[PDB]
Design an enzyme around this catalytic site. Sequence first.
Site, PDB file in Angstrom:
ATOM      1  N   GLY A  63       0.987  -1.525   0.505  1.00 16.69           N
ATOM      2  CA  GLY A  63       0.168   0.511   0.124  1.00 16.69           C
ATOM      3  C   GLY A  63       1.244   1.253   0.281  1.00 16.69           C
ATOM      4  O   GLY A  63       2.201   1.319  -0.524  1.00 16.69           O
TER       5      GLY A  63
ATOM      6  N   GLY B  44       4.745   7.065   3.037  1.00 13.68           N
ATOM      7  CA  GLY B  44       5.818   6.032   2.575  1.00 13.68           C
ATOM      8  C   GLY B  44       4.691   4.589   2.311  1.00 13.68           C
ATOM      9  O   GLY B  44       4.094   4.676   2.762  1.00 13.68           O
TER      10      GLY B  44
ATOM     11  N   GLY C  99       0.754   4.737   2.240  1.00 14.20           N
ATOM     12  CA  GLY C  99       0.888   5.935   3.137  1.00 14.20           C
ATOM     13  C   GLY C  99       1.142   7.052   2.979  1.00 14.20           C
ATOM     14  O   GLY C  99       1.604   7.595   2.242  1.00 14.20           O
ATOM     15  N   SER C 100       0.841   7.953   4.333  1.00 16.02           N
ATOM     16  CA  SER C 100       0.533   9.631   3.831  1.00 16.02           C
ATOM     17  C   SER C 100       2.257   9.884   3.178  1.00 16.02           C
ATOM     18  O   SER C 100       2.059  11.312   2.979  1.00 16.02           O
ATOM     19  CB  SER C 100       0.099  10.402   5.066  1.00 16.02           C
ATOM     20  OG  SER C 100       1.123   9.523   5.920  1.00 16.02           O
TER      21      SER C 100
ATOM     22  N   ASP D 155      -6.661  11.372  10.069  1.00 24.33           N
ATOM     23  CA  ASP D 155      -6.932  10.630   8.765  1.00 24.33           C
ATOM     24  C   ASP D 155      -6.896   9.824   8.817  1.00 24.33           C
ATOM     25  O   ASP D 155      -7.107   8.935   8.610  1.00 24.33           O
ATOM     26  CB  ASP D 155      -5.428  10.731   8.221  1.00 24.33           C
ATOM     27  CG  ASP D 155      -5.145  10.549   7.253  1.00 24.33           C
ATOM     28  OD1 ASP D 155      -6.227  11.745   6.250  1.00 24.33           O
ATOM     29  OD2 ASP D 155      -4.253   9.509   6.246  1.00 24.33           O
TER      30      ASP D 155
HETATM   31  N1  LIG Z   1       0.713  -3.475   7.431  1.00 27.82           N
HETATM   32  C1  LIG Z   1      -0.731  -3.701   7.303  1.00 27.82           C
HETATM   33  N2  LIG Z   1      -1.439  -4.461   5.998  1.00 27.82           N
HETATM   34  C2  LIG Z   1      -1.892  -4.666   4.881  1.00 27.82           C
HETATM   35  C3  LIG Z   1      -1.960  -3.896   4.519  1.00 27.82           C
HETATM   36  C4  LIG Z   1      -1.819  -2.277   4.852  1.00 27.82           C
HETATM   37  N3  LIG Z   1      -0.964  -2.325   6.237  1.00 27.82           N
HETATM   38  C5  LIG Z   1      -1.773  -1.338   4.474  1.00 27.82           C
HETATM   39  C6  LIG Z   1      -2.425  -0.760   2.761  1.00 27.82           C
HETATM   40  N4  LIG Z   1      -2.838   0.488   2.351  1.00 27.82           N
HETATM   41  C7  LIG Z   1      -1.836   1.165   3.609  1.00 27.82           C
HETATM   42  C8  LIG Z   1      -1.240   2.608   3.980  1.00 27.82           C
HETATM   43  C9  LIG Z   1      -1.229   2.943   5.183  1.00 27.82           C
HETATM   44  C10 LIG Z   1      -0.443   1.992   6.392  1.00 27.82           C
HETATM   45 BR1  LIG Z   1       0.962   2.108   7.837  1.00 27.82          BR
HETATM   46  C11 LIG Z   1      -0.609   0.645   6.171  1.00 27.82           C
HETATM   47  C12 LIG Z   1      -1.429   0.607   4.600  1.00 27.82           C
HETATM   48  C13 LIG Z   1      -3.240  -1.247   2.330  1.00 27.82           C
HETATM   49  C14 LIG Z   1      -3.882  -2.245   2.681  1.00 27.82           C
HETATM   50  C15 LIG Z   1      -3.353  -3.746   3.789  1.00 27.82           C
END
Ligand SMILES: Nc1ncc2c(n1)-c1c([nH]c3ccc(Br)cc13)CCC2
Lengths: 334, 335
Positions: free
Chosen positions: A75, A80, A77-78, A183
Amino acid sequence: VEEYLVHALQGSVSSGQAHSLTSLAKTWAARGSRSREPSPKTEDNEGVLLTEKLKPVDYEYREEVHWATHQLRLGRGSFGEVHRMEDKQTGFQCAVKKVRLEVFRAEELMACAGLTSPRIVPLYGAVREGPWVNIFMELLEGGSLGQLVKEQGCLPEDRALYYLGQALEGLEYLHSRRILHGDVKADNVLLSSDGSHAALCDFGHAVCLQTGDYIPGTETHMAPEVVLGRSCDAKVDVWSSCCMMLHMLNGCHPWTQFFRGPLCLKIASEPPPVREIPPSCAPLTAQAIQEGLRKEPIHRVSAAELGGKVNRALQQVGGLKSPWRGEYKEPRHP
Amino acid sequence: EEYLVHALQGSVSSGQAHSLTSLAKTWAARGSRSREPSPKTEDNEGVLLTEKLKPVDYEYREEVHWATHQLRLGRGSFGEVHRMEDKQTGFQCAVKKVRLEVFRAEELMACAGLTSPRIVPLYGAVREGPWVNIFMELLEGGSLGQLVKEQGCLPEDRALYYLGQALEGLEYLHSRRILHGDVKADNVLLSSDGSHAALCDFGHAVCLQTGDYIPGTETHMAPEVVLGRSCDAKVDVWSSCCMMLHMLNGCHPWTQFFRGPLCLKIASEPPPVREIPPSCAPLTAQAIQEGLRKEPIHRVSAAELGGKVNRALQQVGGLKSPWRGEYKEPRHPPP
Ligand SMILES: Nc1ncc2c(n1)-c1c([nH]c3ccc(Br)cc13)CCC2
Ligand SMILES: Nc1ncc2c(n1)-c1c([nH]c3ccc(Br)cc13)CCC2
């Protein structure tokens, strides 16, 4: 002092407690504002790991040596990108968000570190390599609430309430601790493989209350007090949460189908988007959203308050019965 | 031209270097500023320089029109580098992803439209919100840095050959008023057969007509940089010779004899000519001495140095040593 704990932590990667990681993170955020000098051949390597499933060797933890990312991006994030990763010694699989030092905010770790709520994605630690901060967290397997909404068009009222309520539990946990998420949107709540468990994920916009320093998230989810340049408190998240609810129900964000950007002006001037509440919704559902979308933060309900109303509305509709994924429901037309 | 900029904004277009360059200037300016509420749909703008990277309906968005595949290729000064394929054309290239807040226009101004075989070619750059995607030729033989490490250190002829090519590129840039600013093994990329080398990552570049030179790796820094003086292309020449020492010994110049920061030592101590392996050819050693003269003014230009380096290669018998040859132990440090 604590200037001393900081000196003791600097230059090394240690297994330790949240407070230590928090103290180091403040130094990361300060020096990222500090344009730096000639780089040493061997990048600085420092940080704190919060679980034994992530293990430094000889006080180091370095990408490609002690751990590595998997092929595909999880994914974004904001501040990274997020990837799947493996600790090479322990075989543990988790997630990593890689953030440039120059845009790294300590609150990114201060707002979730050591926190033990099931509605908040657990932080496994953070390690710096030169101008990069690697933030480690639980890997979730059911994608984001954002992805779910897009693939289903919209969610059924009961599912929507269910997730909203779980998110409000996390928000309540945060707010009682002087922590504002900043957010709150579907893209930042993550789902279990069976869709039963939801948790808040990305604290890049978080602020640790005592305000004036809130960095705005997505304009459609912004409360009137943010957009007016007024001081902000936890109620900001409550409004965002209700914007997210509308998004789950309608398959589109509030304001977008009726106005053009920037929406900042309209959010301030127009009445709250309660008119976007589906008429098909239950009485208790609609009133909950109305109280959450009160333009005056002061009269606006708290996360705990809103959480109650939402649990009751879920009851009113018969509790959660709609199937995990299921059949596409066409989103509302503009 | 404030009009050319306005016309390009909000869109991804196939176009020319100058257009990309003009937009890139707006990116570096905009990376400055705690931002406002973000629109729900990220801005999407940029310029592609090859039809092998193709926008659809003036868009070019990761996961929609293109995607990365496989494992991280590398790490540049301001961003990670990956393999990618364009979903429309099947074309594979490399992408370096850079945060808007640390994006320098020079990253593109210094290489856009440049047509040297010694400089990695730029295919374009596209912005998605707070991210700038820099597209470039994908090379298959890894970096000179990776080479040096897996072989320990390189044979004299190989080293000369690579040094000479880099100097060809450096000469190319300098004649165009461009100083690379981070000349080191990690920033030279190799063909699959090791025969072609080219300079990459212009994250430290500056476009001359200093005070604005961002230093790279301390071990490759020239005395005039480290003293805080005004800097010119000779900086690259010094670095190149530091890189040469690195290829020969399998270790950077200063690290084995001093502790950091080396800033002081580089300034005070004599040039690291003593790190030249004695077994080296007369012409090789002398070339390095000339590249590593502490006063940039008396230091040879990249062009001058190139001739010496080519001649030195001759005297040694030209390039003969095998590619992916046998491990040669790098020079050990003192007890
Ligand atoms: N740790 C984690 N596990 C699964 C996901 C994600 N993170 C995740 C997605 N977009 C994101 C944006 C910011 C963050 Br911190 C995590 C995700 C995509 C969703 C799947
Ligand atoms: N375009 C391209 N192709 C292949 C590589 C690389 N780039 C590459 C490596 N490290 C790098 C650092 C900065 C940059 Br711009 C590219 C690379 C590692 C060498 C592999």
